[PDB]
Amino acid sequence: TRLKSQGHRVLIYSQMTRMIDLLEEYMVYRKHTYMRLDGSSKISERRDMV
DNA sequence: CCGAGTACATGCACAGGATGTATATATCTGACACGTGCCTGGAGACTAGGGAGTAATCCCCTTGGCGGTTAAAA
């Protein structure tokens, strides 16, 4: 929220995938758009997201 | 000479990730699907005629039922 008045880029590094899923479920209710990068999605979807 | 301990090696377990799998979906197309009238081979109704098998007896063989003997089953 302090960075919201700033408006820079924020990246989250999580070792556990379940914490990334819970981070997407928690960030979805905050109306904050983001994307998840893991070893799950195909290189095409990761290439489009990148 | 023996015991304690530190160090190196190792093995097992967990988590990530890649690849195989299977179903959900999309779409244009051969083929079921559906009128439109034809008609001619069928399908049935209506008299008349035929006929073979059902039904009842009844005579007559072929079954099913008695006691031993050894031969085959055990």
- CB burial string A32-43: b at 16+ within 10 A, e below: eeeebeeeeeee
CA of A14 to C1' of B16 (A): 13
CA A3 to centroid of chain Cα atoms: 16
Q: Is the C-beta atom of A14 closer than 7 angstroms to strand B?
A: no
By what method was this entry solved? cryo-EM
d(CA A35, CA A28): 11
Residues 6+ apart with CB under 8 A from A37: A46, A49, A50
A40: nt with nearest C1' to CA: B17
Q: Is the C-beta atom of A15 closer than 7 angstroms to strand B?
A: yes
Q: Is the C-beta atom of A16 closer than 7 angstroms to strand B?
A: yes
The dihedral built from the CA positions of residue A35, A37, A40 and A44, taken in this order, carries a sign that is: positive
